[PDB]
Amino acid sequence: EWKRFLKNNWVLLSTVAAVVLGITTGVLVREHRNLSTLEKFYFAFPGEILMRMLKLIILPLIISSMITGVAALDSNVSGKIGVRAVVYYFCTTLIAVILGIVLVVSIKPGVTQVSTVDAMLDLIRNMFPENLVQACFQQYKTKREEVKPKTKEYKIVGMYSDGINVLGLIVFCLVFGLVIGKMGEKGQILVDFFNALSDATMKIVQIIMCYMPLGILFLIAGKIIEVEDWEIFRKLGLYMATVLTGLAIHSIVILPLIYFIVVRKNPFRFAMGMAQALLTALMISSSSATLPVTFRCAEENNQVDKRITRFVLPVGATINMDGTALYEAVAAVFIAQLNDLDLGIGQIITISITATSASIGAAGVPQAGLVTMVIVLSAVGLPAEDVTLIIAVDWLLDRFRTMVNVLGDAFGTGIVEKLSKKELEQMDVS
Amino acid sequence: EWKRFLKNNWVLLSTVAAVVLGITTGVLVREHRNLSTLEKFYFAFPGEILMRMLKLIILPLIISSMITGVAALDSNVSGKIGVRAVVYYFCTTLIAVILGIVLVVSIKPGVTQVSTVDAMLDLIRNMFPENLVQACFQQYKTKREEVKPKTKEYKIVGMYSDGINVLGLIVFCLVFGLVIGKMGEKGQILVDFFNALSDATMKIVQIIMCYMPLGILFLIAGKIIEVEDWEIFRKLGLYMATVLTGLAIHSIVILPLIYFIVVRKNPFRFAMGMAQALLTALMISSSSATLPVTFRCAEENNQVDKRITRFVLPVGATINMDGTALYEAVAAVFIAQLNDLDLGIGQIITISITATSASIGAAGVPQAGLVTMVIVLSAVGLPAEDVTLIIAVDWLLDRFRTMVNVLGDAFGTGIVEKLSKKELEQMDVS
Amino acid sequence: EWKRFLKNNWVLLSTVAAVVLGITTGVLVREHRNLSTLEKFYFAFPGEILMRMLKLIILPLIISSMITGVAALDSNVSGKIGVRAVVYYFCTTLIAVILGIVLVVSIKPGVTQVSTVDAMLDLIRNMFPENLVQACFQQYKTKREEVKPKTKEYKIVGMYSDGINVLGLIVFCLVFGLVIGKMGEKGQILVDFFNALSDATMKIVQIIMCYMPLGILFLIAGKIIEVEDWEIFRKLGLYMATVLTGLAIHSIVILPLIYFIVVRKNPFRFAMGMAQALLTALMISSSSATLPVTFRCAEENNQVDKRITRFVLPVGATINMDGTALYEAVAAVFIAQLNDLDLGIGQIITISITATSASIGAAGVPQAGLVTMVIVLSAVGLPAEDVTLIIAVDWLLDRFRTMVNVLGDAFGTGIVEKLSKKELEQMDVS
Ligand SMILES: CC(C)CCC[C@@H](C)[C@H]1CC[C@H]2[C@@H]3CC=C4C[C@@H](OC(=O)CCC(=O)O)CC[C@]4(C)[C@H]3CC[C@]12C
Ligand SMILES: CC(C)CCC[C@@H](C)[C@H]1CC[C@H]2[C@@H]3CC=C4C[C@@H](OC(=O)CCC(=O)O)CC[C@]4(C)[C@H]3CC[C@]12C
Ligand SMILES: CC(C)CCC[C@@H](C)[C@H]1CC[C@H]2[C@@H]3CC=C4C[C@@H](OC(=O)CCC(=O)O)CC[C@]4(C)[C@H]3CC[C@]12C
Ligand SMILES: O=C1NO[C@H]2[C@@H]1CN[C@@H]2C(=O)O
Ligand SMILES: O=C1NO[C@H]2[C@@H]1CN[C@@H]2C(=O)O
Ligand SMILES: O=C1NO[C@H]2[C@@H]1CN[C@@H]2C(=O)O
């Protein structure tokens, strides 16, 4: 069974082979020939074509994915189980993002061993853009300029700079999907159009991901050619330790705390009841393929009713992703600290809004998370070409992210069950 | 019946409350604290967000509205009643626009107490843009530059400046809707797509209009803070007098003159026959909700046949709007004169084309006329932030505009009846 | 039968009348009044409006045409006859384009009697653009800039210049149409949407072509006003001789050579068997209206089976166009040589890719070839206003282009028949 194993596990095997070949190619080139500044640019050309192909696809991706995601989410929510589950999902995703931001600006991996009033208003000025086609490639920014005729008086001058406006497209696609999801039959052709557009965009993303290992091979070789000291391995170790301690103090402290405030039972017996689901999510790395095991572990081991589980588990396997959100926040601030920049209070809120509302805008596909890392890094303006320092270590943390996601919706069943008990009686008598 | 009256009349009541609160807030701020140049900009920030939200929505609005409007108008016109009614509607709308422009440049409310050959060719150069995506945000303009090697010889240099091209989008959406309205079954998916897009855009415009009174509150407070002399109240009085004398000499002189040229009967007995329809259009301010009363007043009081009324009245309640067109022309030139600019012969024809062809491109909705005032002011390049000086007095003239619209299509039934009498005999014998 | 002949042949008659009237108008103006530099620009204004209308329509044209063309081509190919016929079509179109480029840079009609490494990488950088809305109006270009701190070291700086990116739109529409053609039922609304969009775009192109003769009248008058010497008639004669010798050595030498390598029979008896089809394609100038005659001449005169002819002939009448591809390559390099420019090795490959993949992207319509000449001239950045020097002589070469196309797919039936004989036996026994 040699060819079947290659056909089953092509993604992880080809990523690992690309990283190994890129490291040994950069080592064998660095110890055989020097390279000038110009021929260090022609050597990292397939990585440049990959970074162009990844930024090509995010503009149909966020539009189609946000519209169909919030339309299907408006369709799935029916009564009072739906609103409670959705409020729970977005509160825990926001708590995970805030925990990740706090941990990465406190530990600071990557650093070497103005007026905030204007930035927090350019945020709201970028949520409502003045043009919907210019929001696809250019952003707004205001500066304070002094005026000339005893006191010092200024005024505010705004201008449009280059780079895509992700907040404006996210907010307009949210409002547009909520509008066409509520029109009923008169707006079904729009929902079908954007559903087919989302499926076509995910197929093109799969084609780009089939190209990807050649690009990351030449990118990793071009990274380790110019590296002279063994310093960035320490920064990658600290980044992996930051993501792992974020998932550790999110699955152990915060989510049992929420279960103890709401349900007021013992959360650790509940976590011990779901052992086989977490073991399966460690073994196979999908939250949707772990689903029958967590149905079995929440239904017959824990005393959770089936009528609530049937809604909370299959919907929470696709829009409740806490570990991926913590990962994307920590990785975006790590790439920002690696390039010797400083994030303000506008770029941190743009990271925290883009990473929260990307559970909707990833279409529930495992082979798209890299593209989400290009969205967040293009939501604030960072160079995306350091993304190749995260794909090298992604296969070490993917399983732990899956475990944190599955533990999130597994706790969510019990929390939503204890939160609303009147509706089960109302549906049990009639 | 206190809450039902609030649920019925929320628009007018909330606009009036916003104007009153903005005036008393600006008075109580102006007599308690001075404001610098910078903190006069942070105080008028919700108005800036409202003026961004209003300019966000006009680009899907004019595309969807013009395409579905001219497609449904091509569908409604069947024989020779249709062409006569449509030619009548657009001739009277053009006459009302020309009368409004003449009255506002003769009275001149707002003023304080080049080469036209190139501009009239940049008009035609902007009706056919060189790119269809750049027409969504940028315009063309030619200047005359002297050439250097006995006579003085020049040449022409063109460049693209910023701001949306409304004429190019209007002309291309006219041609595109006429094309897909005539393709039959092969172009029905496009008609359904743009119909659903138009309905979604009108729902988002209703959301923006639900936000609107907070924005106009802070805009009116920011207007009357910086005002030192009681001069702009005189200009608002002259603007209201200009709109009222435009509607007065359009409903009394011009439309009975057209009825006397075409029909050669007495128009004033015809106007006295439609008294209850005009009284209802004064009472309730909708031209589509006044429709059964004008059916009754034209059918049984006047001797107008039913077979022509069934087509002229419900189609002319949505695309024949003379009072709104006169209003938008007068208000656009009033905002142009209030900012101490001068309109050429290119901007006046752009105002007269954008205001005429906005009866099609407003989708027949009462809660969208403000957005049309943002289109005309963005068709020529005027600052839209003086729109808040027109919403303060709009509820005084809305009922008179409704009366002029209803009188227009009420005269139109009799004019189209006397114009074509062969078709009624041809459909009466067979 | 005077009015029926005018209704049948309006295109050729109106083009010839426009050329004759433009020449006699330029002669009668040049010998009656001098014209300054400024009034030579107002005289060529309808041609400027025509050249704006032609560039307005190519952006929906290439998108809709490439998507529906490659989707319907993916649908038509079923077994092994389809792949063989498609590979044959694109190999012969590429051979015709290469022959046309070689002949026009060897003969050089139009001439008067950097680093290629960077250009051949900006080609691949423009095939994958960084933004999909900016690909509709702007292109990428890299230059080499020296760096300043013993050897001379440079770096590479890229920037976005104006003009549409045709390679990026062509490649993305190819991949998008291949994706939605393979999704089956889930992507049928996209195929129907782009089919209706393609039909509407071809109707608008027919409207523009109905305007066209007034524009080419004023363009030809403006051309021959400024001409002082009788030199450009010699260049037009050499251009017609270049296109005619390209079609001559493509129909006589190259295609019988391919038939002799593959089939190893006598190709000249095969060409003599199809005499009536070529005579009809000389008489009427359509490759789709010549189709029953070439069915009859290949079926009953030549010994070609019907089961292969039923697929090769009606599909090869619309996507196998060798003469039009040779024509567009020769005409693009002729317009480039007429304006005293020099084409690199990037612009020649952009011409050779845009002209090859425009058989798909012309929607199989005879009244669209002029628009394809605006695409190729806008794929490399040439001034399109010299297109009026090619429409004057197009009706002399259109019939010979039709003959070369028909000879191409007529040889293609026999080549694909001798190439695969196992499938006919497999479908004859079962
Ligand atoms: C580590 C600590 C700081 C975490 C604290 C988390 C809480 C702030 C969150 C987590 C889950 C939240 C709950 C999730 C779901 C709901 C249901 C929600 O229901 C509705 O909005 C009304 C539904 C209806 O009646 O229609 C009300 C808030 C509530 C109880 C939330 C209250 C706030 C909670 C407890
Ligand atoms: C104050 C004064 C200057 C106003 C003058 C207005 C006139 C110039 C307009 C108003 C209504 C117009 C009429 C409205 C409708 C028609 C039908 C229209 O019919 C057709 O186009 C043909 C229909 C067919 O036979 O198919 C011919 C012009 C006509 C009589 C118009 C002629 C010009 C009129 C009288
Ligand atoms: C003047 C000279 C230089 C012209 C040379 C032309 C050749 C390079 C081309 C012309 C037609 C081509 C053939 C057209 C079609 C096919 C079928 C094609 O079939 C497949 O790809 C496999 C189909 C399958 O098995 O599914 C293989 C190549 C082949 C023989 C091509 C081989 C190359 C050929 C002979
Ligand atoms: O549980 C998951 N399924 O798909 C996502 C998430 C973690 N692993 C995937 C990823 O983000 O790569
Ligand atoms: O009669 C009318 N119904 O709707 C329109 C028009 C006048 N009042 C509305 C407006 O334009 O605000
Ligand atoms: O055979 C042909 N039918 O349509 C095309 C091609 C040659 N003549 C047309 C053209 O390109 O103009």
C353: domain CATH number is: 1.10.3860.10
Q: Give the C-side interface with B, CB within 8 Å.
A: 36-38, 41-42, 45, 48-49, 52-53, 55-56, 59-60, 133, 136-137, 164, 189, 192-193, 195-197, 199-200, 203-204, 207
Rounded Cα distance between B319 and B310, Å, is: 15
Instruction: Identify the closest residue of chain B to C51 by CA–CA distance.
Output: B130
**3 state SS of B142:** strand
Give the dihedral sign, CA A44/A47/A48/A49: positive
Q: How many CB pairs under 8 A join A and B?
A: 76
Rounded Cα distance between A306 and A308, Å, is: 5
Q: Distance (Å) from the C-alpha of residue C193 to the closest C-alpha of chain A?
A: 9
Angle at B120 between CA B117 and CA B123, to 5 degrees: 145
Ligand 5 center to B206 CA (angstroms)? 15
Buried-state track C414-427, b at ≥16 Cβ within 10 A, e below 16: bbbbebeeeeeeee
Cα within 13 Å of Cα(A300), Cβ side: 6
Q: Residues with Cβ < 8 Å from A16, sequence gap 6 or more?
A: A395
**3 state SS of B209:** helix
Rounded Cα distance between B50 and C31, Å, is: 62
**3 state SS of C143:** strand
Q: Residues with Cβ < 8 Å from B64, sequence gap 6 or more?
A: B194, B197, B198, B201, B363
Q: Are B247 and B400 in contact (CB under 8 A)?
A: yes
Q: Residues with Cβ < 8 Å from C226, sequence gap 6 or more?
A: C40
Is A360 assigned to a binding site?
yes
- For ligand 1, what atom is nearest to the CA of residue A83? 23
Domain range for residue A281?
2-429
DSSP letter at C363 equals T
Indicate the pairing of strand A154-162 with strand A138-146. antiparallel
Neighbouring chains of C at 3+ CB pairs under 8 Å are A, B
- Bridge partners (DSSP) of residue C142 are C158
Which tokens hold the place of A111? 């650093």
Rounded Cα distance between B277 and B406, Å, is: 8
At residue B359, what is the residue type? Answer: S
Number of structural domains (chain C) is 1
| Ligand nearest, relative to CA of residue C209 | 6
Interchain pair C154, A192: CB under 8 A: no
Mutate which of B57, B68, B197, B206 to disrupt the A interface (most A C-beta within 10 Å)?
A: B197
Binding-site members of C for L-aspartate are 285, 287, 324, 365, 401-402, 405
Rounded Cα distance between B326 and B97, Å, is: 5
E strands in B172-287: none
Q: Residues with Cβ < 8 Å from A405, sequence gap 6 or more?
A: A281, A287, A317, A320, A321, A322, A323, A324
Q: How many CB pairs under 8 A join A and C?
A: 76
At residue C19, what is the residue type? Answer: V
Rounded Cα distance between C405 and C291, Å, is: 12
Q: Give the B-side interface with A, CB within 8 Å.
A: 36-38, 41-42, 45, 48-49, 52-53, 55-56, 59-60, 133, 136-137, 164, 189, 192-193, 195-197, 199-200, 203-204, 207
Nearest CB among A132, A144, A187 relative to B56 is that of A132
R_g of chain A, CA atoms, integer Å: 23
Rounded Cα distance between B224 and C414, Å, is: 85
Interchain pair B196, A189: CB under 8 A: yes
Nearest CA-CA partner of C398 in C268, C294, C243, C288: C243
Angle at A282 between CA A280 and CA A288, to 5 degrees: 60
Q: Is the CB–ligand 6 distance for residue C366 below 6 Å?
A: yes
Interchain pair C124, A49: CB under 8 A: yes
Q: Residues with Cβ < 8 Å from C10, sequence gap 6 or more?
A: none
- For ligand 6, what atom is nearest to the CA of residue C398? 8
Q: Is the CB–ligand 1 distance for residue A80 below 6 Å?
A: yes
Cα within 13 Å of Cα(B165), Cβ side: 28
Which tokens hold the place of C409? 């797919």
Mutate which of C146, C154, C190, C191 to disrupt the A interface (most A C-beta within 10 Å)?
A: C190
Rounded Cα distance between C21 and C224, Å, is: 12
Rounded Cα distance between C307 and C288, Å, is: 19
Angle between the N-to-C axes of helices A188-226 and A166-181, in degrees from 0 to 180, rounded to the nearest 10: 160
Rounded Cα distance between B209 and B12, Å, is: 12
Rounded Cα distance between A276 and B277, Å, is: 75
Rounded Cα distance between A27 and B316, Å, is: 79
Q: Residues with Cβ < 8 Å from A358, sequence gap 6 or more?
A: A325, A328, A372, A375, A376
- Chain centroid to Cα B290, Å, comes to 20
Which tokens hold the place of C14? 């109106």
Nearest CA-CA partner of C59 in B135, B187, A164, A163: B135
Q: Are B217 and B25 in contact (CB under 8 A)?
A: yes
How many beta carbons lie within 10 A of that of residue C315, not counting itself? 21
Q: Is the CB–ligand 3 distance for residue C174 below 6 Å?
A: no
Q: Residues with Cβ < 8 Å from A148, sequence gap 6 or more?
A: none
Ligand 5 center to A255 CA (angstroms)? 55
Rounded Cα distance between B114 and B121, Å, is: 13
Q: Residues with Cβ < 8 Å from C178, sequence gap 6 or more?
A: C70, C71, C74
Which tokens hold the place of C11? 């295109």
- Bridge partners (DSSP) of residue B425 are none
B139 CB-contact burial (10 Å; exposed 0-12 / middle 13-18 / buried 19+)? buried
Contact list, C183 vs chain A (CB under 8 Å): 196, 199-200, 203
Instruction: Give the resolution in Å.
Output: 3.3
Nearest CA-CA partner of A355 in A41, A154, A108, A104: A104
Residue pointed to by tokens 């009697």: C113
DSSP letter at C298 equals I
How many beta carbons lie within 10 A of that of residue C295, not counting itself? 18
Instruction: Identify the closest residue of chain C to A55 by CA–CA distance.
Output: C130
Nearest CA-CA partner of B381 in B139, B212, B52: B139
Rounded Cα distance between B331 and B353, Å, is: 15
Q: Residues with Cβ < 8 Å from C377, sequence gap 6 or more?
A: C332, C335, C383, C384, C387
Rounded Cα distance between A369 and A387, Å, is: 12
Q: What method did the depositors use to determine the structure? A: cryo-EM
Q: How many angstroms separate the Cα of B72 from the Cα of each of B64, B85, B286, C281?
A: 12, 15, 21, 43
Which tokens hold the place of A283? 């073994």
Rounded Cα distance between B259 and B294, Å, is: 18
Q: How many angstroms separate the Cα of C324 from the Cα of each of A8, A397, B378, C399?
A: 47, 56, 45, 11
Breaks in chain B listed by the residue before each, with C–N > 2.5 Å: 113, 149
Interchain pair A52, C154: CB under 8 A: no
